[PDB]
Amino acid sequence: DSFVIRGDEVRQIAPGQTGNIADYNYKLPDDFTGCVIAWNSNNLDSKVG
Amino acid sequence: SALGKLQDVVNQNAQALNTLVKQLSSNFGAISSVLNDILSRLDKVEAEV
């Protein structure tokens, strides 16, 4: 599963979590078997204004 | 005092059951012994521990 996120919400990307992503955008099961992988993209995904 | 044996047998059972009930209030290194309290305070994962 693939998307772009703000750094503050990266900790919501875990089992048992709550907060706007886990609430309303992307949700794991509590017995998730897997890896969570992310990299900053403030060059690729970001612009003045 | 002649009937001591029979009263002793009831007393042992009432004692055992009362202590068995009393242990519900004990905390066992946990945050609380009220079950629904734990569920109200915590992260799902912490509450599971």
Coordinates of all heavy atoms in Angstrom, one line a residue:
Chain A
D1 N 0.8 -1.2 0.0 CA 0.0 0.0 0.0 C 0.9 1.2 0.0 O 1.8 1.3 0.8 CB -0.9 0.0 1.2 CG -1.9 -1.2 1.1 OD1 -2.3 -1.7 0.0 OD2 -2.3 -1.7 2.2
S2 N 0.6 2.2 -0.9 CA 1.5 3.3 -1.2 C 0.7 4.6 -1.2 O -0.4 4.8 -1.7 CB 2.1 3.0 -2.6 OG 1.2 2.9 -3.6
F3 N 1.4 5.7 -0.7 CA 0.9 7.0 -0.5 C 2.0 8.0 -0.1 O 3.1 7.6 0.2 CB -0.3 7.1 0.5 CG 0.0 6.4 1.8 CD1 0.6 7.0 2.8 CD2 -0.4 5.0 1.9 CE1 0.8 6.4 4.1 CE2 -0.2 4.4 3.2 CZ 0.4 5.0 4.2
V4 N 1.7 9.3 -0.1 CA 2.6 10.3 0.5 C 1.9 10.8 1.8 O 0.7 10.9 1.9 CB 2.9 11.5 -0.4 CG1 3.5 12.7 0.2 CG2 3.8 11.1 -1.5
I5 N 2.7 11.0 2.9 CA 2.2 11.5 4.2 C 3.1 12.6 4.7 O 4.2 12.8 4.4 CB 2.3 10.2 5.2 CG1 1.4 10.4 6.4 CG2 3.7 9.9 5.6 CD1 1.4 9.2 7.3
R6 N 2.5 13.4 5.7 CA 3.3 14.3 6.5 C 4.0 13.6 7.6 O 3.4 12.7 8.2 CB 2.5 15.5 7.0 CG 1.4 15.2 8.1 CD 0.7 16.4 8.6 NE 1.6 17.3 9.5 CZ 1.5 18.5 9.7 NH1 0.7 19.3 9.0 NH2 2.2 19.1 10.6
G7 N 5.2 14.0 8.0 CA 6.1 13.3 9.0 C 5.4 13.1 10.4 O 5.6 12.0 11.0
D8 N 4.5 14.0 10.8 CA 3.8 13.8 12.1 C 3.0 12.6 12.2 O 2.8 12.0 13.3 CB 2.9 15.0 12.4 CG 3.7 16.3 12.8 OD1 4.7 16.1 13.6 OD2 3.3 17.4 12.4
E9 N 2.4 12.1 11.1 CA 1.4 11.1 11.1 C 2.1 9.7 10.8 O 1.4 8.7 11.0 CB 0.3 11.4 10.1 CG -0.3 12.8 10.5 CD -1.8 13.0 10.0 OE1 -1.9 13.4 8.8 OE2 -2.7 12.8 10.8
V10 N 3.4 9.6 10.6 CA 4.1 8.4 10.3 C 4.0 7.4 11.5 O 3.7 6.2 11.3 CB 5.6 8.7 10.1 CG1 6.5 7.4 10.1 CG2 5.8 9.4 8.8
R11 N 4.0 7.9 12.8 CA 3.7 7.1 13.9 C 2.3 6.5 14.0 O 2.1 5.5 14.7 CB 4.0 7.8 15.2 CG 3.3 9.2 15.3 CD 4.1 10.2 16.2 NE 5.5 10.3 15.9 CZ 6.1 10.7 14.7 NH1 5.4 11.1 13.7 NH2 7.4 10.6 14.6
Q12 N 1.3 7.1 13.3 CA 0.0 6.5 13.2 C 0.0 5.2 12.3 O -0.9 4.4 12.4 CB -1.1 7.4 12.6 CG -1.2 8.8 13.3 CD -2.1 9.7 12.6 OE1 -2.9 9.4 11.8 NE2 -2.0 11.0 12.8
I13 N 1.0 5.0 11.5 CA 1.2 3.9 10.6 C 1.7 2.7 11.3 O 2.8 2.2 11.0 CB 2.0 4.3 9.3 CG1 1.6 5.7 8.8 CG2 1.8 3.3 8.2 CD1 0.1 5.9 8.5
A14 N 1.0 2.2 12.3 CA 1.3 1.1 13.2 C 0.0 0.4 13.7 O -1.0 1.1 13.8 CB 2.2 1.6 14.3
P15 N 0.1 -0.9 14.1 CA -1.1 -1.5 14.7 C -1.5 -0.8 16.0 O -0.7 -0.2 16.7 CB -0.6 -2.9 15.1 CG 0.9 -2.8 15.1 CD 1.2 -1.8 14.1
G16 N -2.8 -0.9 16.3 CA -3.5 -0.2 17.5 C -3.6 1.3 17.5 O -4.2 1.9 18.4
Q17 N -3.0 2.0 16.4 CA -3.0 3.4 16.4 C -4.4 4.1 16.1 O -5.3 3.5 15.6 CB -2.0 3.9 15.2 CG -0.6 3.7 15.7 CD -0.1 4.7 16.7 OE1 -0.7 5.8 16.9 NE2 0.8 4.3 17.6
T18 N -4.5 5.4 16.5 CA -5.6 6.3 16.2 C -5.0 7.7 15.8 O -3.8 8.0 16.1 CB -6.5 6.5 17.4 OG1 -5.9 7.0 18.5 CG2 -7.2 5.2 17.8
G19 N -5.8 8.5 15.2 CA -5.3 9.8 14.5 C -5.7 9.8 13.1 O -6.0 8.7 12.5
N20 N -5.7 10.9 12.4 CA -6.5 11.2 11.2 C -6.3 10.1 10.1 O -7.2 9.8 9.4 CB -6.2 12.5 10.6 CG -6.1 13.6 11.7 OD1 -7.0 14.1 12.2 ND2 -4.8 14.0 12.1
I21 N -5.1 9.6 10.0 CA -4.8 8.5 9.0 C -5.5 7.2 9.4 O -6.3 6.7 8.7 CB -3.3 8.4 8.7 CG1 -2.7 9.8 8.3 CG2 -3.1 7.4 7.6 CD1 -3.4 10.5 7.1
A22 N -5.1 6.7 10.6 CA -5.7 5.5 11.2 C -7.2 5.6 11.3 O -8.0 4.6 11.1 CB -5.1 5.2 12.5
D23 N -7.7 6.8 11.6 CA -9.1 7.1 11.7 C -9.8 7.1 10.3 O -10.9 6.5 10.1 CB -9.3 8.5 12.3 CG -8.7 8.7 13.7 OD1 -8.4 7.7 14.4 OD2 -8.5 9.8 14.1
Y24 N -9.3 7.8 9.3 CA -10.0 8.3 8.1 C -9.3 8.2 6.8 O -9.9 8.5 5.8 CB -10.4 9.7 8.4 CG -11.3 9.9 9.6 CD1 -11.0 10.9 10.5 CD2 -12.4 9.1 9.8 CE1 -11.8 11.1 11.7 CE2 -13.2 9.2 10.9 CZ -12.9 10.2 11.9 OH -13.7 10.3 13.0
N25 N -8.0 7.7 6.7 CA -7.3 7.6 5.5 C -6.6 6.3 5.2 O -6.7 5.8 4.1 CB -6.3 8.8 5.3 CG -6.9 10.2 5.4 OD1 -7.2 10.8 4.4 ND2 -7.3 10.7 6.6
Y26 N -6.0 5.6 6.2 CA -5.4 4.3 6.0 C -5.2 3.6 7.4 O -4.7 4.2 8.3 CB -4.0 4.4 5.3 CG -3.3 3.1 5.1 CD1 -3.8 2.2 4.1 CD2 -2.2 2.7 5.9 CE1 -3.2 1.0 3.9 CE2 -1.6 1.5 5.6 CZ -2.1 0.6 4.6 OH -1.5 -0.6 4.4
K27 N -5.6 2.4 7.5 CA -5.8 1.7 8.8 C -5.2 0.3 8.7 O -5.6 -0.5 7.9 CB -7.3 1.6 9.1 CG -7.7 0.6 10.2 CD -7.4 1.0 11.6 CE -8.2 0.1 12.5 NZ -7.9 0.4 14.0
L28 N -4.3 -0.1 9.7 CA -3.7 -1.4 9.8 C -4.6 -2.3 10.8 O -5.3 -1.7 11.7 CB -2.3 -1.3 10.4 CG -1.3 -0.6 9.5 CD1 -1.3 0.9 9.7 CD2 0.1 -1.1 9.9
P29 N -4.7 -3.6 10.6 CA -5.1 -4.5 11.7 C -4.1 -4.6 12.8 O -2.9 -4.3 12.6 CB -5.3 -5.9 11.0 CG -4.2 -5.8 9.9 CD -4.2 -4.4 9.5
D30 N -4.6 -4.9 14.0 CA -3.7 -5.0 15.2 C -2.7 -6.2 15.1 O -1.6 -6.1 15.7 CB -4.5 -5.2 16.5 CG -5.4 -4.0 16.8 OD1 -5.2 -2.9 16.2 OD2 -6.2 -4.1 17.7
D31 N -3.0 -7.3 14.4 CA -2.1 -8.4 14.1 C -1.4 -8.3 12.8 O -1.0 -9.3 12.2 CB -2.8 -9.7 14.3 CG -4.0 -10.0 13.3 OD1 -4.4 -9.1 12.6 OD2 -4.4 -11.2 13.3
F32 N -1.2 -7.1 12.3 CA -0.5 -6.8 11.0 C 0.9 -7.5 11.0 O 1.7 -7.4 11.9 CB -0.3 -5.3 10.9 CG 0.7 -4.9 9.8 CD1 0.3 -5.0 8.5 CD2 1.9 -4.3 10.1 CE1 1.1 -4.5 7.5 CE2 2.8 -3.9 9.1 CZ 2.4 -3.9 7.8
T33 N 1.2 -8.3 9.9 CA 2.5 -8.9 9.7 C 3.1 -8.3 8.5 O 2.5 -8.4 7.4 CB 2.2 -10.4 9.4 OG1 1.7 -11.0 10.6 CG2 3.5 -11.2 9.2
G34 N 4.2 -7.6 8.6 CA 4.6 -6.6 7.6 C 5.8 -5.7 8.0 O 6.3 -5.7 9.1
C35 N 6.1 -4.8 7.1 CA 7.0 -3.7 7.3 C 6.4 -2.4 6.8 O 5.6 -2.3 5.9 CB 8.4 -3.9 6.6 SG 9.5 -5.1 7.4
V36 N 6.7 -1.3 7.6 CA 6.4 0.1 7.3 C 7.6 0.8 6.9 O 8.6 0.9 7.6 CB 5.8 0.7 8.6 CG1 5.5 2.2 8.4 CG2 4.5 0.0 8.9
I37 N 7.6 1.3 5.6 CA 8.8 1.9 5.0 C 8.4 3.3 4.5 O 7.4 3.4 3.8 CB 9.3 0.9 3.9 CG1 9.7 -0.5 4.5 CG2 10.5 1.6 3.2 CD1 10.1 -1.5 3.4
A38 N 9.2 4.3 4.8 CA 9.0 5.6 4.3 C 10.3 6.4 4.1 O 11.3 6.1 4.7 CB 8.1 6.4 5.3
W39 N 10.2 7.4 3.2 CA 11.3 8.3 2.9 C 10.8 9.7 2.6 O 9.9 9.9 1.9 CB 12.2 7.8 1.8 CG 11.6 7.5 0.5 CD1 11.8 8.2 -0.6 CD2 10.7 6.4 0.1 NE1 11.1 7.6 -1.7 CE2 10.5 6.5 -1.3 CE3 10.1 5.2 0.7 CZ2 9.7 5.5 -2.0 CZ3 9.4 4.3 0.0 CH2 9.2 4.4 -1.3
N40 N 11.5 10.7 3.2 CA 11.2 12.2 3.0 C 11.4 12.5 1.5 O 12.3 12.1 0.8 CB 12.1 13.0 3.9 CG 11.7 14.5 3.9 OD1 11.7 15.2 2.9 ND2 11.4 15.0 5.1
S41 N 10.4 13.3 1.0 CA 10.3 13.7 -0.4 C 10.0 15.2 -0.6 O 9.4 15.6 -1.5 CB 9.3 12.8 -1.1 OG 8.0 13.0 -0.5
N42 N 10.5 16.1 0.4 CA 10.3 17.5 0.3 C 11.0 18.2 -0.9 O 10.9 19.4 -1.1 CB 10.7 18.1 1.7 CG 10.3 19.5 1.9 OD1 9.2 19.9 1.5 ND2 11.1 20.3 2.5
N43 N 11.8 17.5 -1.7 CA 12.2 17.8 -3.0 C 11.2 17.5 -4.1 O 10.9 18.3 -5.0 CB 13.6 17.2 -3.3 CG 13.6 15.7 -3.1 OD1 12.8 15.0 -2.6 ND2 14.7 15.1 -3.7
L44 N 10.7 16.2 -4.2 CA 9.8 15.7 -5.2 C 8.4 16.2 -5.1 O 7.7 16.4 -6.1 CB 9.8 14.1 -5.2 CG 11.2 13.4 -5.4 CD1 11.0 11.9 -5.2 CD2 11.7 13.7 -6.8
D45 N 7.9 16.3 -3.9 CA 6.4 16.4 -3.6 C 6.0 17.7 -3.0 O 5.0 17.8 -2.4 CB 6.1 15.2 -2.7 CG 6.2 13.9 -3.4 OD1 5.7 13.7 -4.5 OD2 6.7 12.9 -2.7
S46 N 6.8 18.8 -3.2 CA 6.7 20.0 -2.5 C 7.1 21.2 -3.3 O 8.0 21.1 -4.2 CB 7.6 19.9 -1.2 OG 7.5 21.0 -0.4
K47 N 6.4 22.4 -3.1 CA 6.7 23.6 -3.9 C 6.4 24.8 -3.1 O 5.6 24.8 -2.2 CB 5.8 23.5 -5.2 CG 6.1 24.6 -6.2 CD 5.4 24.4 -7.5 CE 5.7 25.6 -8.5 NZ 5.1 25.4 -9.8
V48 N 7.0 25.9 -3.5 CA 6.8 27.3 -2.8 C 5.3 27.6 -2.9 O 4.7 27.4 -3.9 CB 7.7 28.3 -3.5 CG1 7.5 29.7 -2.8 CG2 9.2 28.0 -3.4
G49 N 4.8 28.2 -1.8 CA 3.3 28.4 -1.7 C 2.5 27.1 -1.5 O 1.6 27.1 -0.7
Chain B
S1 N -18.8 -26.4 70.9 CA -17.4 -26.9 70.7 C -17.3 -28.4 70.3 O -16.3 -28.8 69.7 CB -16.5 -26.6 72.0 OG -17.1 -27.3 73.1
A2 N -18.4 -29.2 70.6 CA -18.4 -30.5 70.1 C -18.6 -30.6 68.6 O -18.0 -31.5 68.0 CB -19.6 -31.2 70.8
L3 N -19.3 -29.7 67.9 CA -19.5 -29.6 66.5 C -18.3 -28.9 65.7 O -18.5 -28.7 64.5 CB -20.8 -29.0 66.2 CG -22.1 -29.8 66.5 CD1 -22.5 -29.5 68.0 CD2 -23.2 -29.3 65.6
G4 N -17.2 -28.6 66.3 CA -16.2 -27.8 65.7 C -15.8 -28.3 64.3 O -15.7 -27.4 63.4
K5 N -15.6 -29.6 64.0 CA -15.3 -30.1 62.7 C -16.2 -29.6 61.6 O -15.7 -29.2 60.5 CB -15.4 -31.7 62.8 CG -14.3 -32.3 63.6 CD -14.4 -33.8 63.5 CE -13.2 -34.5 64.3 NZ -13.2 -35.9 64.1
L6 N -17.5 -29.7 61.8 CA -18.4 -29.3 60.7 C -18.4 -27.8 60.4 O -18.3 -27.4 59.3 CB -19.9 -29.8 61.0 CG -20.0 -31.3 61.3 CD1 -21.5 -31.6 61.5 CD2 -19.4 -32.1 60.2
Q7 N -18.4 -27.0 61.5 CA -18.3 -25.6 61.4 C -17.0 -25.2 60.7 O -16.9 -24.3 59.8 CB -18.5 -24.9 62.7 CG -18.6 -23.4 62.6 CD -19.8 -22.9 61.8 OE1 -20.9 -23.5 62.0 NE2 -19.7 -22.0 60.9
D8 N -15.9 -25.8 61.0 CA -14.6 -25.7 60.4 C -14.6 -25.9 58.9 O -14.2 -25.1 58.1 CB -13.6 -26.6 61.2 CG -12.1 -26.5 60.7 OD1 -11.8 -25.7 59.8 OD2 -11.3 -27.3 61.3
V9 N -15.3 -27.0 58.5 CA -15.4 -27.3 57.0 C -16.2 -26.2 56.3 O -15.7 -25.7 55.2 CB -16.1 -28.6 56.8 CG1 -16.6 -28.9 55.4 CG2 -15.0 -29.7 57.1
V10 N -17.3 -25.6 56.8 CA -17.9 -24.5 56.2 C -17.0 -23.3 56.2 O -16.9 -22.6 55.2 CB -19.3 -24.2 56.8 CG1 -19.9 -23.0 56.2 CG2 -20.2 -25.4 56.6
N11 N -16.4 -23.0 57.4 CA -15.5 -21.8 57.5 C -14.4 -21.9 56.5 O -14.1 -20.8 55.8 CB -15.0 -21.8 58.9 CG -16.0 -21.4 60.0 OD1 -17.2 -21.1 59.7 ND2 -15.6 -21.3 61.2
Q12 N -13.7 -23.0 56.3 CA -12.7 -23.1 55.2 C -13.2 -22.8 53.9 O -12.5 -22.0 53.1 CB -12.1 -24.6 55.2 CG -11.2 -24.8 56.4 CD -10.7 -26.3 56.4 OE1 -10.4 -26.8 55.4 NE2 -10.7 -26.9 57.5
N13 N -14.4 -23.2 53.5 CA -14.9 -22.9 52.2 C -15.3 -21.4 52.1 O -14.9 -20.8 51.1 CB -16.1 -23.8 51.9 CG -15.6 -25.2 51.4 OD1 -15.3 -25.4 50.3 ND2 -15.4 -26.1 52.3
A14 N -16.0 -20.9 53.0 CA -16.4 -19.4 53.0 C -15.1 -18.6 53.0 O -15.0 -17.6 52.2 CB -17.2 -19.1 54.2
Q15 N -14.1 -18.9 53.7 CA -12.8 -18.3 53.7 C -12.2 -18.3 52.3 O -11.8 -17.3 51.7 CB -11.9 -18.9 54.8 CG -10.3 -18.7 54.6 CD -9.9 -17.3 54.1 OE1 -9.2 -17.1 53.2 NE2 -10.4 -16.2 54.8
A16 N -12.1 -19.5 51.7 CA -11.5 -19.7 50.4 C -12.2 -18.9 49.3 O -11.6 -18.1 48.6 CB -11.5 -21.2 50.0
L17 N -13.6 -19.0 49.3 CA -14.4 -18.2 48.3 C -14.2 -16.7 48.5 O -14.0 -16.0 47.6 CB -15.8 -18.6 48.4 CG -16.1 -20.0 47.9 CD1 -17.6 -20.4 48.1 CD2 -15.8 -20.1 46.4
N18 N -14.3 -16.2 49.8 CA -14.1 -14.8 50.0 C -12.7 -14.4 49.5 O -12.6 -13.4 48.8 CB -14.3 -14.4 51.5 CG -15.8 -14.3 51.8 OD1 -16.7 -14.6 50.9 ND2 -16.2 -13.9 53.0
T19 N -11.6 -15.1 49.8 CA -10.3 -14.7 49.3 C -10.2 -14.8 47.8 O -9.7 -13.8 47.1 CB -9.1 -15.5 49.9 OG1 -9.0 -15.1 51.3 CG2 -7.8 -15.2 49.3
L20 N -10.9 -15.8 47.1 CA -10.9 -15.9 45.7 C -11.6 -14.6 45.1 O -11.2 -14.1 44.1 CB -11.7 -17.2 45.3 CG -12.0 -17.3 43.8 CD1 -10.8 -17.4 43.0 CD2 -12.9 -18.6 43.6
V21 N -12.7 -14.2 45.7 CA -13.4 -12.9 45.3 C -12.5 -11.8 45.6 O -12.2 -11.0 44.7 CB -14.7 -12.8 46.0 CG1 -15.3 -11.4 45.8 CG2 -15.7 -13.8 45.4
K22 N -11.9 -11.7 46.8 CA -11.0 -10.5 47.2 C -9.9 -10.3 46.2 O -9.5 -9.2 45.8 CB -10.4 -10.7 48.6 CG -11.5 -10.6 49.7 CD -11.8 -9.1 50.1 CE -10.6 -8.5 50.8 NZ -10.9 -7.1 51.3
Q23 N -9.3 -11.4 45.6 CA -8.2 -11.3 44.6 C -8.6 -10.5 43.4 O -7.7 -9.9 42.8 CB -7.6 -12.6 44.3 CG -6.6 -13.1 45.3 CD -5.3 -12.3 45.3 OE1 -5.3 -11.2 45.8 NE2 -4.2 -12.8 44.9
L24 N -9.9 -10.3 43.1 CA -10.3 -9.5 41.9 C -9.9 -8.0 42.1 O -9.6 -7.3 41.2 CB -11.8 -9.5 41.7 CG -12.4 -10.9 41.3 CD1 -13.8 -10.8 41.0 CD2 -11.7 -11.4 40.0
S25 N -9.8 -7.5 43.4 CA -9.4 -6.1 43.7 C -7.9 -6.0 43.6 O -7.4 -4.8 43.5 CB -9.8 -5.7 45.1 OG -11.2 -5.8 45.2
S26 N -7.1 -7.0 43.6 CA -5.6 -6.9 43.6 C -5.1 -6.5 42.2 O -5.8 -6.7 41.2 CB -5.0 -8.3 44.0 OG -5.4 -8.5 45.3
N27 N -3.9 -6.0 42.1 CA -3.4 -5.3 40.9 C -2.3 -6.1 40.1 O -2.2 -5.8 38.9 CB -2.9 -3.9 41.3 CG -4.1 -3.1 41.9 OD1 -5.0 -2.7 41.1 ND2 -4.1 -2.9 43.1
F28 N -1.6 -7.0 40.7 CA -0.7 -7.9 39.9 C 0.4 -7.2 39.0 O 0.6 -7.6 37.9 CB -1.5 -8.9 39.1 CG -2.6 -9.6 39.9 CD1 -3.9 -9.1 39.9 CD2 -2.3 -10.8 40.7 CE1 -4.9 -9.7 40.6 CE2 -3.3 -11.4 41.4 CZ -4.7 -10.9 41.3
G29 N 0.9 -6.1 39.5 CA 1.8 -5.2 38.8 C 1.1 -4.4 37.6 O 1.8 -3.8 36.8
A30 N -0.2 -4.5 37.5 CA -1.0 -3.7 36.5 C -1.3 -2.3 37.0 O -1.4 -2.1 38.2 CB -2.2 -4.5 36.2
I31 N -1.7 -1.4 36.1 CA -2.1 0.0 36.4 C -3.3 0.1 37.3 O -3.5 1.1 38.0 CB -2.3 0.7 35.0 CG1 -2.5 2.2 35.2 CG2 -3.4 0.1 34.2 CD1 -2.4 3.0 33.9
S32 N -4.2 -0.9 37.2 CA -5.5 -0.9 37.9 C -6.0 -2.3 38.0 O -5.6 -3.2 37.2 CB -6.5 0.0 37.1 OG -7.8 0.1 37.7
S33 N -7.0 -2.5 38.9 CA -7.8 -3.8 38.9 C -9.2 -3.6 38.5 O -10.0 -4.6 38.5 CB -7.7 -4.4 40.3 OG -8.3 -3.5 41.3
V34 N -9.6 -2.4 38.0 CA -10.9 -2.2 37.4 C -10.7 -2.4 35.9 O -9.9 -1.7 35.2 CB -11.4 -0.8 37.7 CG1 -12.7 -0.5 36.9 CG2 -11.6 -0.5 39.1
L35 N -11.3 -3.4 35.3 CA -11.0 -3.8 33.9 C -11.3 -2.7 32.9 O -10.5 -2.3 32.0 CB -11.7 -5.1 33.6 CG -11.5 -5.7 32.2 CD1 -10.1 -5.8 31.8 CD2 -12.1 -7.1 32.2
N36 N -12.5 -2.1 32.9 CA -13.0 -1.1 32.0 C -12.3 0.2 32.1 O -12.2 1.0 31.2 CB -14.5 -1.0 32.1 CG -15.2 -2.4 32.1 OD1 -15.0 -3.2 31.1 ND2 -16.0 -2.8 33.1
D37 N -11.8 0.5 33.3 CA -10.9 1.6 33.6 C -9.6 1.5 32.7 O -9.3 2.5 31.9 CB -10.5 1.6 35.1 CG -9.4 2.6 35.5 OD1 -9.3 3.6 34.9 OD2 -8.8 2.3 36.5
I38 N -9.0 0.4 32.7 CA -7.8 0.2 31.8 C -8.1 0.5 30.4 O -7.4 1.2 29.7 CB -7.3 -1.3 32.0 CG1 -6.9 -1.6 33.4 CG2 -6.0 -1.5 31.1 CD1 -6.8 -3.1 33.7
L39 N -9.2 -0.1 29.9 CA -9.7 0.2 28.5 C -10.0 1.6 28.2 O -9.9 2.1 27.1 CB -10.9 -0.7 28.3 CG -10.7 -2.2 28.3 CD1 -12.0 -3.0 28.3 CD2 -9.9 -2.7 27.1
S40 N -10.4 2.4 29.2 CA -10.6 3.9 29.1 C -9.4 4.7 29.1 O -9.3 5.7 28.4 CB -11.6 4.3 30.2 OG -10.9 4.5 31.4
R41 N -8.3 4.3 29.8 CA -7.1 5.1 29.9 C -6.1 5.1 28.8 O -5.4 6.1 28.5 CB -6.3 4.7 31.2 CG -7.0 5.0 32.5 CD -5.9 4.7 33.6 NE -6.6 4.4 34.9 CZ -6.1 4.5 36.1 NH1 -4.9 5.0 36.3 NH2 -6.7 4.1 37.1
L42 N -6.1 4.0 28.1 CA -4.8 3.6 27.4 C -5.0 3.3 25.8 O -6.0 3.1 25.3 CB -4.3 2.3 28.0 CG -3.7 2.4 29.4 CD1 -3.3 1.1 29.9 CD2 -2.5 3.3 29.4
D43 N -3.8 3.4 25.2 CA -3.6 2.7 23.9 C -4.0 1.2 24.0 O -3.6 0.5 24.9 CB -2.1 2.8 23.6 CG -1.5 2.0 22.4 OD1 -2.3 1.3 21.7 OD2 -0.3 2.2 22.1
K44 N -4.8 0.7 23.0 CA -5.1 -0.7 22.8 C -4.0 -1.6 23.1 O -4.2 -2.7 23.8 CB -5.6 -0.8 21.4 CG -6.1 -2.2 20.9 CD -7.5 -2.4 21.5 CE -8.1 -3.8 21.1 NZ -8.3 -3.9 19.6
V45 N -2.8 -1.4 22.7 CA -1.6 -2.2 22.9 C -1.2 -2.2 24.4 O -1.0 -3.3 24.9 CB -0.4 -1.8 22.0 CG1 0.8 -2.6 22.2 CG2 -0.9 -1.9 20.5
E46 N -1.1 -1.1 25.0 CA -0.8 -1.0 26.4 C -1.9 -1.7 27.2 O -1.6 -2.5 28.1 CB -0.7 0.5 26.9 CG 0.5 1.2 26.3 CD 1.8 0.8 26.8 OE1 1.9 0.0 27.8 OE2 2.9 1.2 26.2
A47 N -3.2 -1.4 26.9 CA -4.3 -2.1 27.6 C -4.2 -3.6 27.4 O -4.4 -4.3 28.4 CB -5.6 -1.5 27.0
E48 N -3.8 -4.1 26.3 CA -3.6 -5.6 26.1 C -2.5 -6.1 27.1 O -2.7 -7.1 27.7 CB -3.3 -5.9 24.7 CG -3.1 -7.4 24.4 CD -1.7 -8.0 24.8 OE1 -0.7 -7.2 24.8 OE2 -1.5 -9.2 24.9
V49 N -1.4 -5.4 27.3 CA -0.4 -5.8 28.3 C -1.0 -5.8 29.7 O -0.9 -6.8 30.4 CB 0.8 -4.9 28.2 CG1 1.9 -5.2 29.3 CG2 1.5 -5.1 26.8

